[PDB]
Amino acid sequence: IQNQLKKLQSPIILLYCTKEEATYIFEVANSVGLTGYGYTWIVPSLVAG
Amino acid sequence: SIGIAVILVGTSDEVAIKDAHEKDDFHHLSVVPRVELVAMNETDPKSIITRICDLMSDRKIQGVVFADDTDQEAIAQILDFISAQTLTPILGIHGGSSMIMADKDESSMFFQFGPSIEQQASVMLNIMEEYDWYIFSIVTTYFPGYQDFVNKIRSTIENSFVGWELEEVLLLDMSLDDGDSKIQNQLKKLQSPIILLYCTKEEATYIFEVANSVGLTGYGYTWIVPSLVAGDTDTVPSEFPTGLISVSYDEWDYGLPARVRDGIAIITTAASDMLSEHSFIPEPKSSCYNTHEKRIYQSNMLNRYLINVTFEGRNLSFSEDGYQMHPKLVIILLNKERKWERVGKWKDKSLQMKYYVWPRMDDHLSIVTL
Amino acid sequence: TVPQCCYGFCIDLLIKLARTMQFTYEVHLVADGKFGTQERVQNSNKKEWN
Amino acid sequence: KIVNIGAVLSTRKHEQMFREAVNQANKRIQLQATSVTHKPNAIQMALSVCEDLISSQVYAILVSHPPTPNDHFTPTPVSYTAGFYRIPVLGLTTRMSIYSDKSIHLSFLRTVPPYSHQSSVWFEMMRVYNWNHIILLVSDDHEGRAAQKRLETLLEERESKAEKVLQFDPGTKNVTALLMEARELEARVIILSASEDDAATVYRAAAMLDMTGSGYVWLVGEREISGNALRYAPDGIIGLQLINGKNESAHISDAVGVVAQAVHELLEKENITDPPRGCVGNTNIWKTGPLFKRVLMSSKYADGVTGRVEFNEDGDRKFAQYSIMNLQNRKLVQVGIYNGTHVIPNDRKIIWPGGETEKPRGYQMSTRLK
Structure with missing residues (x-):
């Protein structure tokens, strides 16, 4: 999942999941590093x- | 009648080296240099220095060239220090003495066979131009040699008539504590299809592991x-x-x-030419202790004349920094199995590839046109 | 080099600027006789204007 | 266990003082004292160092300056001897800028400020004096090149290019050409950084061309103030001088304390191996050499007898004290002190060159254009 999340290049992303799933996705994005400015x-x- | 010594380390064909040294002919130069083949182990550098001093004080020895099967630069540094202290001419055939030091001593007399920092960058640029590459990146560790090589490559690419596209330069340091996250985040900013790396073995392995963890290291x-x-x-x-x-x-x-035989013959010819032209042969007390007063006889003429020598239709002239003018280099490639395969050889700024089409590793179609 | 005479539009503008800003100048032609271009020939490994 | 230390220095009275200091600090893991004198040669000194390392099996060797005026060749021998076994070495009175690159000296520590900080001190003084046009005049040498590079980096950090840079050859008998070329500019801040031998000739050539009158400012260093340059030195020249550079017993206590702290912080690690006593037997590299050096580099001292003790990236002792002297009526007197952050002047008055009490602007306005 972390390797596939790096393929994202657009400046906007839509997420639709549960609370725990959204928290896990946010943690994965913070670990990747593409979640601060762009x-x-x-x-x-x-x-x- | 100049004293030339030859020292070997480890296992080596001493009979072949002796035959090659005896087959050398220097009747035109009239040097008549003697050969002294001595074997030595890898005990320590102090024992090597003691053996070198004994060989120099043995019978008017004015030069010695040794080879070692190891790869530590400490032996080469100690040899350069001994040559600078004793003011005697010493050369390195291959092995550990073949390492090219960054900053050489000013009042020293040392010459080695190998390529320089700018030569490798020029060869890489030529290979990239031959491979139709027009984009690259710059990435190096905190080592001063890597930074100097990157600066030289940038200065060479700046004054280029052809086009060039430089994305950015990376100077991340791996010595910081807990700094792997910042390095991994900064490595994602790379977008060019080619990247240059110049660091140590452990640093290169760490960079490769970080690239594999990032995922931009498989195809593009x-x-x-x-x-x-x-x-x-x-x-x-x-x-x-x-x-x-x-x-x-x-x-x-x-x-x-x-x-080794060619180098010995070239050194003997240079010594004979110097003794014939300047009419001065340096033969001081080849001792180890109390070497401060041994600098009364300057040996700068032998060092200045050793940068211009030729024999058997070959050019062996060195440079001011202590590097060969025309070195021998080769190209290595990585196959499926872990091994090194010779791809091409470069000499005198002339590339020679063994394949007209570079191996790319269904795409790659063939199109015919008239 | 031989001394010559100089006058025209550029000389008039130079005299006007010298009278306005009250400075001194020494006008002299160029030995090359051309405007200049970018000499980026890689044969000498150097790039400079002429 | 018991672990001894090694050292090599002259002035046996200072050796006994250091031994007494070590015996006193041992009361704060058993440490011993082992020191020897200096030999009149490099090979003899290296052999003595190897014998001492084989007899004591210490992990650190302290080197100081000898009674010679240069005091540069003695530090290279001990460093080259310690580099074979990757043993760390700490210097006490090492100020040569040539021993800065990590390639030549792998493991080497200093306890004084190198000549690289002189460029930063000059830049800080020029910034405090509100100056923007200076001329850097340095001779062709390693220390001169390092100072020029540091000055260029400090200038490019503030986005300000240099006015004019002039380089001279070491030992040039005639230097009037460089002075005539420099006298055709618009700047008045002339910075000189060379040896004491050429400094007298430079001052003579400057006084002969009437370039030391009113409106000129001369900024020199410690090397240009000492020696025989004071005989022909001009009035109003502002130089630099180390606070504790002449004293060597004050830094010895701090070095011993740092070594004790490093030995205490390194003995509590796993896979630790002591230095082998086989100097002539084995030539392997001690795995505890890089870790101990890395621990000592980051071993920040809380407080000492010579101020805060720290270590820079390329083995440099930062946070140094400088005395701003002034040559007035053939008498040198301090006027301020730069404690790293800034320089606080004293209540005394300063006399600029030419007898002008007011501070000079240090710039001119050209009226002739081409």
């Missing part, structure tokens, strides 16, 4: 709760 | 390393990507005894 994440209403 | 990656990154072609760390291109010294084709 990253835009959009989540649905069920991701926050 | 080209890594170029210097001759000091491999060192031993027989041993492989099993962590480098397949298809790596690196330069190395021509050792599989060049013979050690023939090269």
